Amino acid sequence: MNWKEFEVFCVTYLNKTYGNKFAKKGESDSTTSDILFTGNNPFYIEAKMPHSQCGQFVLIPNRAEYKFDYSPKNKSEINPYTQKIMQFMSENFSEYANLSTKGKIIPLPESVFVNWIKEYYKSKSVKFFITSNGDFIIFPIEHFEHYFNVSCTYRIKKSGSRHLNSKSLPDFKQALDKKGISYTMRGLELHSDENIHDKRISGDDKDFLIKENNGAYHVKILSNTFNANVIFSISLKNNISLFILNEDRKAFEAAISL
DNA sequence: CTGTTGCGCTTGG
DNA sequence: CCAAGCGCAACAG
Ligand SMILES: [Ca+2]
Ligand SMILES: [Ca+2]
Incomplete structure (x- = not known):
């Protein structure tokens, strides 16, 4: 599985095991950590x-x-x-x-x-980490090195990338026609019968990338x-003690009970 | 509004 | 095992 699905599988594990008190923040959202425990003592959990x-x-x-x-x-x-x-x-x-x-x-x-x-x-404000080795393992940040x-x-x-905007479509249309392929663009929504998923085109000091999200294709501008x-x-x-995993599992159950 | 840049994420080979 | 960047948000121009 990928990391997006892995974060979901962690928070779906936390919600079923300890109650519905774990909110997931945005995927690729970097302003804060992944999972927020909405208990009486609220803290964040980071899924790796x-x-x-x-x-x-x-x-x-x-x-x-x-x-x-x-x-x-x-x-x-x-x-x-x-x-x-x-x-x-x-x-x-x-x-x-x-x-x-x-x-x-x-x-x-x-x-x-x-x-x-x-x-x-x-x-x-991360107090605990969560990760799997076949089963979920949870530990506070102070035992990270173990x-x-x-x-x-x-x-x-x-x-990272950015959305194609109004200003740079002329350079992107010019770069697409020089590639010689079907397309029709309604606004910035790009349609074509040929599969152009993850295709990279260049031109005018800009590299573009094409991806399909809602049956149609949209365009990303790569960075410089x-x-x-x-x-x-x-x-x-690989080989971790079991006295440590239980000691920190109880520290977690004690932390969501404050 | 445009585009840099930094941070999220393992991922791709 | 080793190499490597796109999807996001914050921010100056
Ligand atoms: Ca995160
Ligand atoms: Ca994470």
């Missing part, structure tokens, strides 16, 4: 799949100063663990200056990465920003 990514922050390479700078447009403030990572990379600047989509892993200890994740998700192995890398991650962010990757540990 066994192989997930776990937060990021962009660093701008100051090639003139040979140091790395925190992007002022980041959405989380610098914590002592952010400055630790930045201090390492700027000590090894030239080895990290060659930005790449493949990225360079950061060989600092895993404890520092756990701490950054702990502080990032505490700022989001469930996930954390790697950290510095890689380019191209920014290619910045580099420190980003974390987590993997669920």
Whole structure:
């Protein structure tokens, strides 16, 4: 299953097991965490799949100063663990200056990465995580390191897409006719008898993507920003103790009972 | 209103 | 195992 379905399967599990007190926030909605417990003591729960990514922050390479700078447009403030990572990379600047989509892993200890994740998700009022290994496993944020192995890398991650708008349809129609294919466009609703799902066309300093949602096709404009962010990757540990899973399951049942 | 940018998400190969 | 970006919201121009 995908992550969208996985978040639903978690909250449908929580609602059936503990009552209808778990609201899911928007999918791809990033302003807050996934699941909101609407009890007397309300808190958030974050659903991760066994192989997930776990937060990021962009660093701008100051090639003139040979140091790395925190992007002022980041959405989380610098914590002592952010400055630790930045201090390492700027000590090894030239080895990290060659930005790449493949990225360079950061060989600092895993404890520092756990701490950054702990502080990032505490700022989001996350009290517990939920994930499955065949059955659902739930634990509070303070026991994170006992469930996930954390790697950290510095890689380019191209920014996301936007809807095609009124201004850029002329460039998109011109790029589609140069491709030589059926179509008819009513407004921005694109119709065609040929399957053009996930087709990518280019032109006029813009790359477009075509997707079907409601029987017809709509168009996305791909980004042009290619910045580099420190980003974390987590993997669920295979053999986990059972004294720990029950101890943190009861901490969860005690938290939704306040 | 347009377009950058950062953050969500594993996903694709 | 290794490489890599689109779907979102916030925000300056
Ligand atoms: Ca989320
Ligand atoms: Ca999540």
